[PDB]
Design a binder for this molecule. Structure first.
Ligand SMILES: Nc1ncnc2c1ncn2[C@@H]1O[C@H](COP(=O)(O)OP(=O)(O)O)[C@@H](O)[C@H]1O
Ligand SMILES: Nc1ncnc2c1ncn2[C@@H]1O[C@H](COP(=O)(O)OP(=O)(O)O)[C@@H](O)[C@H]1O
Ligand SMILES: Nc1ncnc2c1ncn2[C@@H]1O[C@H](COP(=O)(O)OP(=O)(O)O)[C@@H](O)[C@H]1O
Ligand SMILES: [Mg+2]
Ligand SMILES: [Mg+2]
Ligand SMILES: [Mg+2]
Lengths: 371, 35, 97, 97, 23, 371, 371
């Protein structure tokens, strides 16, 4: 019996079977509900739209994200997300397939309680397990030691592991990722004359952020270059046919990852978070940590981020260390791909939470069994 | 002038009446301190 | 963590990946003696019956003039280490003067 | 090391050609590098005699290590005096404030 | 030990890597 | 001339005159700096806030602690701490008052160097002395023999003294106290759903720890009691009006003092530190150490700690000894109080480090005069 | 059959065959257990690391020394140490090889009882002997008479021998050696700012002590020289890339051997122990103990100790008679070397404790067959 890997991220649900490069269902985690007066009768009008169907008809819908910063708020919407990704995207019964689920660290435990109760009572499985995303990222990296910076759409977390031993006191969580960058890009696109206020326009701002933005190596030199000459300005076409051109906003938007005070937040950037997570570890393993930095998630897909992060850590680390950052082209789905590693492992078959253990222990064995 | 200024050699209560000796009074004052 | 034929072929090849100073010093300290070589060439019977110790020495003696190769390989690695530690120090002393 | 490399080159040159074609270029590179190190040491002797005539010590009695240790301790005393004078000026400024 | 002396003298990785190419 | 006692704690500065019972200025040691953009010009917008002003305005301030584990890291901030506690709190000239200062043992010497240089040239006192906190706690206890556990905000240290003779080889230092308990409470309050990330919310988590937490007599029985029934759950009101309820975190938080492996430290607990500090002494005084366990500091102010501490030592000690924890009801300010008796001692007046001795001997006599 | 020599000291196990020059397996005696939570599954996570593997992987391990001051406290750990040094280091069968173990004098007898019983019933040999380390050091020195000062990692003991005759009433034991020097260096490196608290950091402080420390010829002049100018300061590189520079701690740390009051011990130094051990003997041999002061152990490997102890004994001895320290260049392994000559001696073959004699006499022959 093949297992299931379902990364339920804040932005994109990535679901599929065991042992694939791409997740079989990659779609944004949105539930659409109509906000206008339906005047035509019949023609297959639906009260809700999930996935790319909501993306297609987004002009006449209000889109809701059931997951915000790794914590699921609306649960009936999350049940609709799971029912759509089981019965329609993958078209398989949940009663005959074990399902590995991912989780951000330092998540509230009631979220684990409710996903265990819903997964064992609404979409009742033979077994399910709740795992950490950074461990799967280190699996997909193909190594054992190293520090992982995961950055999805709600959660950016740093986890250091040495020889298979994670350090739970050194795990750091930062609620700053691509949704906050999309909101900041909405805030700074208003400067050039372009207004985007609705939830349907969030997809357009996210598409602009995905296509045109990049990470600058030196911030102030790129400010001087953008202010002096318009060589950095690039164009984009909206679906209504309008043409926009952006300059410095190509590299002001991801800079909030390296400078969180742009959106008004006290905590430090991702390179200071990486460095402080390194120095919280014991002193002997740090040389192994500096040469094995791992980035995963879609937020580190800008084509300037590895050289900038190397420059910042080499500024922070002492000069006798080789700062090597692993930045594969496959790192957008590597959180899923290491889930293909762990679910296919022969040593993982005894660690699943079965139906019977849930039946004596209630929905509380998931704390003592998982991380 | 500043070297000559700095680095020159310089030019050269009522009486506590008691019927006890001192040692017993101080031992009692140590003894009553811990209460 | 390998067969004796790989060790003998790598000594014959002179590849210096996992042959440092101490392993070749140990190898020089266990050198095949005169009566050992004279007993090994006097063997006529089946090769597989003898121990691995004889097998390593016959694979080593198959190489023409093994001891010069072991000594110059050790001396080349040592000369590289002495050059890497002395030459920046000597340039630092000359620059200091 | 140079004496051992020269003896090694003489031993390889008397040996068979299979040793020679593999090892003579590394031996020649090591001998040339150590010879350049020996003229570097001779330049260090020339700068040592120039420093002994500079500092007006005897050429046979001057130790370069003692001179560099004296310069290191003097540079540490220089930096300590600079920091103490800077702190004294700062404390006088805050006292006047 | 005496009965032991008497009785003597007498893949995950390629499986997943094949199927990642299917997407 | 009246003397000054100024316990420069890691979390709270307690300063006041000699001969007084209560410390005059007890206030937290934080330097605030604004992190937002001020738009209203004028009306005395200070660039820094020190003390209770930083506490009252903490919602727009990044708060920095100048003292970390008894070692002063930022020195301009700690100069601002000393300027505030001399000029604003006590309202006295430092150049006309001797000033006893406190210190954790096994402190780096350059800290004592810089404190001596600042207190003799910036705030140039006639005389100052650098004492040890546990000796002052034994002064406030009134007895002469005893072993002192002092646990503050950064440093928990054990010092045994018999007949006024400390044993310097038996002094033990542990960098685990109330700030680590606060950060562990931040890590475990995320389980119930309450997120606290900024340094402004550190004062809220510290207030929750001060008001509601208590030391369990037996850990496993209290975990079973909290898991079975919700009678140990207690409520608290946040400043934004939200009501929280906590259960096992009332006694999981102070249990880190007895079990340091919760926050990833290899060291043993405070009871094993006390027992090893007793057994590092000579034999004939050990009984006199068992009946005089002096406990001081604000970390030992939970209302369950004396019975647990007696239970742990009684488990560790042989059965023919009367374990007696000396836990006074006003043990929070005992370091300052014993500084006040020591500053008012007539024999202490010859042990001051004067201005003239500093000018003759540099800033190095504090190693050769203090202990 | 060839014999085995295994100096199973407090710090470093030195084991090898008989008749060999150098000990083949020299490795420190530590048992390392993990203290963090392992999240990776598979690829052989062991629960206990012994030897060089514990040294390489020390950043996630608690290391325990099974031997403390020559007395084995934890016996399962010492069983694993013997298992590693037989099966994994030498790769030998102990059932077909005799074995000479080393022991400090004035050891508790039940320690020798348990060495005999575990060595004869877990790793059951044809024969085994327990020898005094100073006698083996005199075997390595190649002379018959002399006083031997041995100083390993736990025990510094003095034994004088004249013409083959050890005087048992003149043997002295002092529980002060390189582990106490390492702990004192951990205490005094905190003065310069460098904090070392874990068991893994003990190895780094031990590497600092092995690489940089030296015995001063005159202590007060060296303190004055280090206080005056920074010519005696030397730098070292930590595994995290930080560069430390130490001064007087290079020669304050080995001074505890000559001044035991630094760590609170009442007993006198090793020079007074050597002089009192000579003076406790009969008179006519004392001259022959002055010219043959044999040193051994790794603690006497500092490059200033022979001239210093010659100066101290020459101050202590009468001036009409020569003092000569016998300090070989290979005095680290001299206990093993003299064990190799004694194991290869023809006359020693009658002094083995055979298995038949052990079965006849119980575990009681080792009191009467050995010293
Ligand atoms: N090529 C790209 N360049 C820049 N940003 C991207 C790119 N691809 C995706 N992103 C952004 O990274 C975010 C994280 O993607 P993902 O980790 O799949 O989100 P989740 O899994 O949480 O739904 C997405 O919200 C997306 O906006
Ligand atoms: N009632 C209380 N219960 C528990 N902890 C407290 C209480 N009051 C204060 N604390 C803790 O004690 C600390 C203050 O200790 P303090 O006496 O100032 O020691 P120090 O002077 O070494 O900082 C604070 O950080 C706080 O967390
Ligand atoms: N080169 C050196 N210089 C100074 N000290 C050393 C040196 N080598 C070893 N030591 C110290 O001496 C000890 C080695 O002595 P040894 O007799 O081997 O101890 P053991 O046999 O108990 O392991 C080590 O604990 C180490 O601290
Ligand atoms: Mg994600
Ligand atoms: Mg305090
Ligand atoms: Mg030894």
């Amino acid at each position: 019996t093949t297992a299931l890997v379902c990364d339920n991220g804040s932005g994109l649900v990535k679901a599929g079977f065991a042992g694939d490069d791409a997740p079989r269902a990659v779609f944004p985690s949105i539930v659409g509900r109509p906000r206008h007066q339906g005047v035509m009768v019949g023609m297959g009008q639906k009260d809700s739209y999930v996935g790319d169907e909501a993306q297609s008809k987004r002009g006449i819908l209000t889109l809701k994200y059931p997951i915000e910063h790794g914590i699921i708020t609306n649960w009936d919407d999350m049940e609709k997300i799971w029912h759509h990704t089981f019965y329609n995207e993958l078209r398989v019964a949940p009663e005959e397939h074990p399902t590995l689920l991912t989780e951000a660290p330092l998540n509230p435990k009631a979220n684990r309680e409710k996903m265990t109760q819903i997964m064992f009572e609404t979409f009742n499985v033979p077994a399910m397990y709740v795992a950490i995303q950074a461990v799967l990222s280190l699996y997909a990296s193909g190594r054992t030691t190293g520090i992982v910076l995961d950055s999805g759409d709600g959660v950016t977390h740093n986890v250091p592991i040495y020889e298979g031993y994670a350090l739970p006191h050194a795990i750091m969580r930062l609620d700053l990722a691509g949704r906050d960058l999309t909101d900041y890009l909405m805030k700074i696109l208003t400067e050039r004359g372009y207004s985007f206020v609705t939830t349907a326009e969030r997809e357009i701002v996210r598409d602009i952020k995905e296509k045109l933005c990049y990470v600058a190596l030196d911030f102030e030199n790129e400010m001087a270059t953008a202010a002096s000459s318009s060589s950095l300005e690039k164009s984009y076409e909206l679906p209504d046919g309008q043409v926009i051109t952006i300059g410095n906003e190509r590299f002001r938007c991801p800079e909030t990852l390296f400078q969180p005070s742009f959106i008004g937040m006290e905590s430090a950037g991702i390179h200071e978070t990486t460095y402080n997570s390194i120095m919280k570890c014991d002193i002997d393993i740090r040389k192994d940590l500096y040469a094995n930095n791992v980035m995963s998630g879609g937020t580190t897909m800008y084509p300037g981020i590895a050289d900038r992060m190397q420059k910042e850590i080499t500024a922070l680390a002492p000069s006798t260390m080789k700062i090597k950052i692993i930045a594969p082209p496959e790192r957008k789905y590597s959180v899923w791909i290491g889930g293909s590693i762990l679910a296919s492992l022969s040593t993982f078959q005894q660690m699943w939470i079965t139906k019977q253990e849930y039946d004596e222990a209630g929905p509380s064995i998931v704390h003592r069994k998982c991380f | 002038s500043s070297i000559e200024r700095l680095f020159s050699f310089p030019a050269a209560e009522p009486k506590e009446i008691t019927f006890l000796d001192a040692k017993k009074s101080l031992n009692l004052n140590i003894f009553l301190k811990q209460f | 963590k390998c067969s004796n034929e790989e060790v003998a072929a790598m000594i014959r090849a002179g590849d210096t990946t996992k042959f440092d100073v101490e392993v070749l010093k140990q190898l020089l300290k266990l050198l095949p003696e005169k009566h050992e070589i004279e007993n090994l060439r006097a063997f006529t019977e089946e090769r597989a019956k003898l121990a691995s110790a004889d097998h390593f020495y016959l694979l080593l003696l198959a190489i023409p003039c093994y001891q010069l190769r072991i000594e110059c390989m050790l001396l080349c690695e040592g000369a590289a280490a002495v050059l890497d530690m002395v030459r920046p120090k000597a340039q630092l002393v000359l620059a200091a003067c | 090391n140079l004496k051992k490399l020269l003896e090694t080159e003489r031993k390889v040159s008397a040996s068979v050609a299979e040793v020679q074609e593999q090892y003579t270029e590394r031996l020649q590179a090591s001998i040339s590098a150590f010879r350049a190190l020996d003229e570097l040491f001779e330049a260090i002797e020339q700068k040592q005699r120039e420093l002994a005539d500079y500092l007006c010590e005897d050429a046979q009695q001057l130790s370069l290590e003692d001179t560099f240790s004296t310069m290191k301790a003097f540079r540490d005393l220089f930096l300590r005096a600079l920091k103490e004078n800077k702190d004294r000026k700062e404390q006088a400024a805050k006292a006047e404030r | 030990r005496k009965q032991q002396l008497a009785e003597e003298e007498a893949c995950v990785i390629d499986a997943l890597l094949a199927d990642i190419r299917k997407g």
